[PDB]
Design an enzyme around this catalytic site. Structure first.
Site, PDB file in Angstrom:
ATOM      1  N   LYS A  93      -4.005  -0.742  16.209  1.00 28.83           N
ATOM      2  CA  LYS A  93      -4.743   0.053  15.389  1.00 28.83           C
ATOM      3  C   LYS A  93      -5.719   0.975  16.159  1.00 28.83           C
ATOM      4  CE  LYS A  93      -2.681  -1.098  11.318  1.00 28.83           C
ATOM      5  NZ  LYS A  93      -2.035  -0.044  10.564  1.00 28.83           N
ATOM      6  N   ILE A 109       0.678  -1.024   0.164  1.00 33.02           N
ATOM      7  CA  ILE A 109      -0.065   0.124  -0.023  1.00 33.02           C
ATOM      8  C   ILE A 109       0.968   1.229   0.043  1.00 33.02           C
ATOM      9  CG2 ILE A 109      -1.571   1.226   1.395  1.00 33.02           C
ATOM     10  CD1 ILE A 109      -2.900  -1.566   2.261  1.00 33.02           C
ATOM     11  N   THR A 121      -6.353  -6.035   1.286  1.00 37.16           N
ATOM     12  CA  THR A 121      -5.795  -5.415   0.237  1.00 37.16           C
ATOM     13  C   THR A 121      -4.471  -6.395  -0.181  1.00 37.16           C
ATOM     14  OG1 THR A 121      -6.109  -3.373   0.957  1.00 37.16           O
ATOM     15  CG2 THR A 121      -4.320  -3.318  -0.846  1.00 37.16           C
ATOM     16  N   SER A 163      -5.173   2.761   9.086  1.00 40.57           N
ATOM     17  CA  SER A 163      -5.457   1.999  10.213  1.00 40.57           C
ATOM     18  C   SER A 163      -5.838   0.868   9.542  1.00 40.57           C
ATOM     19  CB  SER A 163      -6.541   2.652  11.025  1.00 40.57           C
ATOM     20  OG  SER A 163      -6.940   1.665  12.286  1.00 40.57           O
ATOM     21  N   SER A 164      -7.071  -0.101   9.990  1.00 39.89           N
ATOM     22  CA  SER A 164      -7.498  -1.260   9.435  1.00 39.89           C
ATOM     23  C   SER A 164      -9.215  -1.306   9.826  1.00 39.89           C
ATOM     24  CB  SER A 164      -6.777  -2.331  10.236  1.00 39.89           C
ATOM     25  OG  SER A 164      -7.624  -3.576   9.820  1.00 39.89           O
ATOM     26  N   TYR A 205      -2.991  -6.763  16.896  1.00 42.40           N
ATOM     27  CA  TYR A 205      -2.974  -5.933  15.756  1.00 42.40           C
ATOM     28  C   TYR A 205      -4.091  -4.768  16.037  1.00 42.40           C
ATOM     29  CZ  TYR A 205      -3.353  -4.478  10.871  1.00 42.40           C
ATOM     30  OH  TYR A 205      -3.596  -3.803   9.685  1.00 42.40           O
TER      31      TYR A 205
HETATM   32  N1  NAP Z   1      -2.649  -5.500   3.407  1.00 44.55           N
HETATM   33  C1  NAP Z   1      -3.815  -5.513   4.062  1.00 44.55           C
HETATM   34  O1  NAP Z   1      -4.933  -6.295   3.774  1.00 44.55           O
HETATM   35  C2  NAP Z   1      -4.202  -4.396   5.018  1.00 44.55           C
HETATM   36  C3  NAP Z   1      -5.406  -4.335   5.515  1.00 44.55           C
HETATM   37  C4  NAP Z   1      -5.568  -3.180   6.245  1.00 44.55           C
HETATM   38  C5  NAP Z   1      -4.591  -2.300   6.766  1.00 44.55           C
HETATM   39  N2  NAP Z   1      -3.506  -2.525   6.318  1.00 44.55           N
HETATM   40  C6  NAP Z   1      -2.333  -1.535   6.817  1.00 44.55           C
HETATM   41  O2  NAP Z   1      -1.790  -0.900   5.682  1.00 44.55           O
HETATM   42  C7  NAP Z   1      -0.264  -0.620   5.917  1.00 44.55           C
HETATM   43  C8  NAP Z   1       0.685  -1.201   4.945  1.00 44.55           C
HETATM   44  O3  NAP Z   1       0.412  -2.743   4.806  1.00 44.55           O
HETATM   45  P1  NAP Z   1       0.937  -3.437   3.598  1.00 44.55           P
HETATM   46  O4  NAP Z   1       0.064  -4.400   3.446  1.00 44.55           O
HETATM   47  O5  NAP Z   1       1.050  -2.755   2.413  1.00 44.55           O
HETATM   48  O6  NAP Z   1       2.333  -4.063   4.348  1.00 44.55           O
HETATM   49  P2  NAP Z   1       3.628  -4.717   3.551  1.00 44.55           P
HETATM   50  O7  NAP Z   1       3.382  -5.042   2.033  1.00 44.55           O
HETATM   51  O8  NAP Z   1       3.880  -5.647   4.711  1.00 44.55           O
HETATM   52  O9  NAP Z   1       4.753  -3.526   3.594  1.00 44.55           O
HETATM   53  C9  NAP Z   1       4.955  -2.838   4.870  1.00 44.55           C
HETATM   54  C10 NAP Z   1       5.842  -1.479   5.008  1.00 44.55           C
HETATM   55  O10 NAP Z   1       6.272  -1.142   5.959  1.00 44.55           O
HETATM   56  C11 NAP Z   1       7.749  -1.111   6.296  1.00 44.55           C
HETATM   57  N3  NAP Z   1       7.778  -1.630   7.668  1.00 44.55           N
HETATM   58  C12 NAP Z   1       7.478  -2.749   8.286  1.00 44.55           C
HETATM   59  N4  NAP Z   1       7.916  -2.677   9.557  1.00 44.55           N
HETATM   60  C13 NAP Z   1       8.601  -1.591   9.553  1.00 44.55           C
HETATM   61  C14 NAP Z   1       9.326  -1.250  10.757  1.00 44.55           C
HETATM   62  N5  NAP Z   1       9.526  -1.602  12.036  1.00 44.55           N
HETATM   63  N6  NAP Z   1      10.366  -0.122  10.521  1.00 44.55           N
HETATM   64  C15 NAP Z   1      10.200   0.828   9.210  1.00 44.55           C
HETATM   65  N7  NAP Z   1       9.263   0.068   8.541  1.00 44.55           N
HETATM   66  C16 NAP Z   1       8.693  -0.904   8.562  1.00 44.55           C
HETATM   67  C17 NAP Z   1       8.283  -2.456   5.367  1.00 44.55           C
HETATM   68  O11 NAP Z   1       9.458  -2.025   5.033  1.00 44.55           O
HETATM   69  P3  NAP Z   1      10.615  -2.791   4.479  1.00 44.55           P
HETATM   70  O12 NAP Z   1      10.288  -3.277   3.037  1.00 44.55           O
HETATM   71  O13 NAP Z   1      11.948  -2.536   4.493  1.00 44.55           O
HETATM   72  O14 NAP Z   1      10.447  -4.207   5.308  1.00 44.55           O
HETATM   73  C18 NAP Z   1       7.374  -2.067   4.246  1.00 44.55           C
HETATM   74  O15 NAP Z   1       7.633  -0.965   3.130  1.00 44.55           O
HETATM   75  C19 NAP Z   1       0.074  -1.307   7.263  1.00 44.55           C
HETATM   76  O16 NAP Z   1      -0.209  -0.233   8.363  1.00 44.55           O
HETATM   77  C20 NAP Z   1      -1.089  -2.233   7.568  1.00 44.55           C
HETATM   78  O17 NAP Z   1      -1.169  -2.480   9.034  1.00 44.55           O
HETATM   79  C21 NAP Z   1      -3.165  -3.543   5.430  1.00 44.55           C
END
Ligand code: NAP
Ligand code: NAP
Ligand code: NAP
Ligand code: NAP
Lengths: 257, 257, 252, 252
Positions: free
Chosen positions: D163, D17, D192, D145-146, D159
């Site tokens: 959030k 995202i 997502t 958030s979520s 989690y």
């Molecule tokens: N995917 C879903 O279904 C979903 C749904 C609702 C909400 N969300 C929220 O949307 C946001 C992005 O989710 P995503 O699915 O795109 O996640 P993702 O694909 O797992 O990407 C995580 C991103 O955050 C960085 N990150 C993780 N831990 C970190 C840390 N300790 N310090 C600095 N950077 C860190 C990672 O950096 P690196 O690449 O260096 O590891 C990466 O760029 C999150 O806050 C998640 O809770 C996701």
């Protein structure tokens, strides 16, 4: 007549109560974005014409539709005019975007509310939007948009506006139930809640009320209609495709407690 | 006739739609607690008499009041009967506790809802409770209680019940606005939202619907009316003095997403 | 009373809202574990007050927010319950202990943040986790939150965050525990006179009183009466809920 | 585009995202700081993609959830902004970085809890705190958030708690920052597809798709389009809000 293109080019829109205030701002914004806009009114035909002409002078397309809402035959009158106009201009009756904006407001002691006052508030603010949605479904293509203009007063106790609050509470239920109903057709259905907004009315000219309204927002101002319209135009676009069944707070931080 | 004492001894209560279902359970519980209960009905006079007699055989005090709600003169008819009965039994017209429980339910395609259907739902479920509250204020002492029986369906998208959802959304606004209005009089005003509840109706006898209703609660059962009544009785008591303007979820975990 | 034969843990029961809750649950018949961090004499007073009025109670010391906290708490609790009842069963859990602070958001330190979250959210989560092993079907978990999760209050944002986390416990655990008929709910008091000097300062008391639609700050008993209802069979159909016990503080 | 002349920080922009958000903000004209913890090559790809399409961007490494994290982040960010623009001004802050986990609530450890809270709530708070010193009037703070803060999900309670804390930032800071016309909002995506292997497993993808009323899991671009709107002047009258970008996951 020169044609300005935008993200909504090819789309059609009905904005109820588009002759003035928030509705006018919504129509202007949707028109600027390229939608063919049906500018609806009850009795302000000159104001509605001014809006439609504004949209056309700025490179858009628009026409006016008269319908008094809250009376028998209202939805038929509305859709006869809408569909005639859409057919004349596009060859089809398709309606992509529906904005239920028309509404009435009132301030008075709860003890003084009469049954006739209740019926009128409910008829215009809740009943008509339900039946407009019901009728629109027969002509709205998949990927459409329904946006209902509610009020922050559904979240802020305001004794002198309880009847209005009740009517908007009913209105908000439309987005909840219809979003699920229409998911498979990818029609999004959302409520937008404006905060106090300068609609240019006589009531905003009154110093006593106008003073208290400005302090409701965390920004210490009442909204310009364009600030609300920009939110509605976003919801009407492709960019808001993943937003449905939502309450969108466009109150400038009025709902912070 | 033996007199059982309880926390509501000395108080008076009106429970609308107390002849059966949730309302019956509410009346029984308030009566057991010592309140003089006006058991209201539209046409189920024999059922209402059974409830009132139950309350009296268990050491309480109760009487029935007939009023069809949602028609002209409804609130006048209701309060003529209530106040006559209260005056006969206590020497005064004071009403301490008001429970707006009477309501109608309906399931049907949103496309099939008629204006007459909408009006009836709104007239019974939202309009009448507003005007009952308005009329009750003239006879409710400081420290009173107003409890409006809503529905979890205001938080769960249910296309086949959108009209009902709209009416309950309007109902919920009563507690929000009137809680503020009545703060200085220390009258609390709250909404209670039951989940699916076995009211003994014909619709609960239908296997297809009854199967899906049981799974709405996290407990995997529909509610017994007594489970809802116990919540209402708490809200009616001194123990709920610091709860006003609230939405109280009595749905057995139906609103968990 | 309606809790006779039940056992209860009320965290932070030495003073304030928790003391009122302990007193009310004890009066209703529950064997109450009166928990505290350093207020041993005050905790002893509460336990004695419960006994004096015909109930049963005992005190349990555990500083929350530090390693080993939940182990200390449950060693003391379970030993005390087994001694008194012959079982370690815990029917009612009230996560009441909490810390409050006011200050400019620009001055919040990481240490301040950790402390607030450790006491107000983390310890309640691990207390719930540990309680599951000894809570019978029909149990009750009640978390004391705050109206400030719904009223923007910049000088209390870190507290707000901690209480926002706490509120999620009821949401997710209500679904987890449905088949055991354990209800899990959040109660949100408004401003409540906890006996601290803050509430005796007229200017502060006046400001806080105006937050409620009643124009008063709450007595702890007003909150305790709500908690005792939630702990009872009368609240069996309430789970996963946010219960507003704020005297109309959340009206906008 | 509508963000020309603006600067933006998108945390966790190396993938998923956050990558979509960075790409969208860069296309709209913002100078984007593409933040990452260890995904340096992926972050570099995002920054190059922004440049390739006519924008400006650079990468900034900071592991969040450890001592010194915000100092590292802001040293890199402010140096990079000053080098490129002549000022350290930060117009738009998107707290997107976050960690996700699924497991039985009985197996959650204190270490797991601390990590989740440290990354998902604590670091966003201190990032906001630090951003205030360099954010001009008319700025934008958007916290990702979520939907799980509104849908009971026992295998994700920690989690959820994190959030729930994160969501309080928008409530309290919206009021704090009103006079500076900085808006502060939460966006709640539904499920997502972030490009992870999890989403390519048919059974898991099918289950997750059914959460939305549309019967699909979101593309990251669908979330990014909402964030870009919030970052724009078109969302100037939205503050302190919870914006549901879940495709109808929160309908009950
Ligand atoms: N995917 C879903 O279904 C979903 C749904 C609702 C909400 N969300 C929220 O949307 C946001 C992005 O989710 P995503 O699915 O795109 O996640 P993702 O694909 O797992 O990407 C995580 C991103 O955050 C960085 N990150 C993780 N831990 C970190 C840390 N300790 N310090 C600095 N950077 C860190 C990672 O950096 P690196 O690449 O260096 O590891 C990466 O760029 C999150 O806050 C998640 O809770 C996701
Ligand atoms: N202003 C605020 O502070 C504020 C705040 C929150 C929400 N809202 C909501 O925003 C919406 C627009 O408000 P506003 O302030 O822009 O209104 P406004 O300036 O009074 O304009 C009302 C519009 O609705 C039309 N209308 C009124 N009654 C009608 C009827 N019975 N049948 C058909 N059309 C009717 C009017 O048409 P004519 O010109 O023909 O009379 C006019 O175009 C309303 O739903 C209102 O409840 C307003
Ligand atoms: N059952 C559920 O699952 C459920 C769930 C959530 C909320 N609710 C709400 O709970 C309340 C009670 O529901 P229920 O299931 O107990 O209802 P129910 O068994 O149908 O009983 C309805 C009661 O309301 C009275 N009533 C109906 N229409 C009336 C009218 N027009 N004028 C005066 N009285 C009228 C009936 O009187 P007569 O006997 O004279 O006809 C009866 O006493 C309603 O507000 C309902 O919306 C029910
Ligand atoms: N008062 C209000 O206006 C108000 C409003 C809304 C919500 N609340 C919430 O209601 C709850 C009780 O508040 P109160 O006003 O009654 O508080 P209080 O008077 O400050 O009492 C705090 C209680 O919690 C215990 N405690 C504090 N930190 C602890 C720790 N680290 N480990 C173990 N115990 C600890 C204290 O034990 P010791 O005596 O040993 O120090 C004491 O018994 C709190 O969760 C608070 O957030 C209060």
């Amino acid at each position: 007549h020169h044609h300005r293109s935008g993200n909504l080019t090819g789309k059609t829109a009905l904005v109820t109560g588009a002759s003035r205030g928030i509705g006018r701002a919504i129509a202007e914004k949707l028109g600027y974005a390229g939608a063919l806009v049906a500018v609806h009114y009850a009795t302000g035909a000159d104001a509605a014409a001014e809006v439609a002409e504004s949209i056309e002078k700025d490179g858009g397309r628009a026409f006016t539709v008269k319908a008094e809402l809250g009376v028998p035959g209202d939805v038929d009158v509305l859709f006869e005019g809408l569909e005639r106009g859409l057919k004349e201009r596009t060859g089809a009756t398709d309606l992509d975007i529906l904005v239920n904006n028309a509404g009435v407001m009132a301030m008075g002691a709860p003890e003084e509310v009469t049954p006739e006052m209740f019926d009128r508030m409910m008829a215009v603010n809740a009943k008509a939007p339900f039946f407009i949605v019901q009728r629109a479904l027969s002509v709205m293509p998949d990927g459409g948009r329904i946006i209902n203009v509610s009020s922050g007063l559904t979240r802020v106790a305001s004794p002198d506006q309880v009847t209005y609050g009740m009517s908007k509470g009913a209105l908000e239920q439309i987005a909840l139930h219809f979003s699920r109903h229409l998911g498979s057709r990818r029609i999004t259905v959302n409520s937008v809640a404006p905060g106090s907004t300068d609609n240019g009315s006589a009531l905003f000219q009154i110093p006593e009320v106008r003073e208290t309204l400005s302090q409701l927002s965390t920004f210490g101002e009442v909204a310009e209609p364009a600030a609300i319209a920009d939110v509605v135009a976003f919801l009407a676009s492709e960019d808001a495709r993943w937003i449905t069944g939502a309450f969108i707070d466009a109150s400038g931080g009025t709902l912070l407690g």
